[PDB]
């Protein structure tokens, strides 16, 4: 009956905890590790980007230019202008946020759950951790 | 001064990205091409190994039997197990590592990178990917 709505409950609860210890550990680059901070924000990314139900990991800066991205396909906006309104609301409202997209990676139109997470170091916010899930695969599991 | 860092860091990113384009490929050979894996294993492995800096590359699979290896003097040690603790415990973790290791191929003891890729198909560790690479020419090409 309603193991669906554990499912997506306990998907939402991972994904959320990532995303935490994402923006802690990019915290820590900062706080206590120091000091080429994009590359230790890339790798931290694709690290975390390893589990399957992770389409994509990008991190935008306070200046919204997106410095790391998972994807291979996307290499090529890294360095560019993030054209994106909930990214925005999150370096601005300084909170995060999450909702729902329709995205065609080319199987179809895919039920893909974007989460956005600001990562603030010191009282700034530097910037915003941007997680595509695939929220589709719970009701594939399912 | 640094260029020594950022010539072992653009080596470490160049065998993680080979090893994943790997892994992702031996995955295909099940999930979309199907179906006598271990020849394809086998060609995928010495397509791979012509890089001069990957110095060998063994498919170990989950019960720990090396399937594969592009080693001409090596072709022995395939059916036969694998003696190898990283090996294992990246079949059990089913998690990446990497570590340096000393090996003398008949030149002297060489610096040598291992990196381990766990291959996991539909949710099922089927084996593990082992890689040396030749650490060593990149205070060669420095």
Same sequence: chains 1, 2.
Avoid: C, M
Wanted: aromatic share 8%; net charge neutral; no cysteine.
């Amino acid at each position: 009956n309603n193991l669906e709505k554990e499912l997506l409950d306990n998907f939402k609860k991972n994904i959320t905890q990532y995303a935490k210890q994402l923006e802690i550990s990019i915290e820590k680059v900062y706080d206590e590790k120091g000091s080429n901070a994009q590359k230790d924000i890339q790798n931290l990314l694709s690290e975390y980007a390893n589990r399957q139900e992770i389409g994509e990991i990008r991190f935008i800066d306070k200046d919204q230019i997106i410095i790391a991205t998972t994807k291979q396909s996307n290499r090529s906006l890294i360095n560019q202008k993030a054209n994106d309104s909930s990214v925005q609301k999150a370096l601005s409202l300084g909170q995060s946020n999450d909702h729902l997209i329709l995205k065609d990676y080319g199987g179809g139109k895919d039920r893909v759950w974007v989460y956005n997470i600001p990562v603030k170091v010191d009282k700034k916010v530097i910037g915003n951790i941007y997680i595509e899930s695939k929220i589709n695969d719970v009701y594939n599991q399912l």
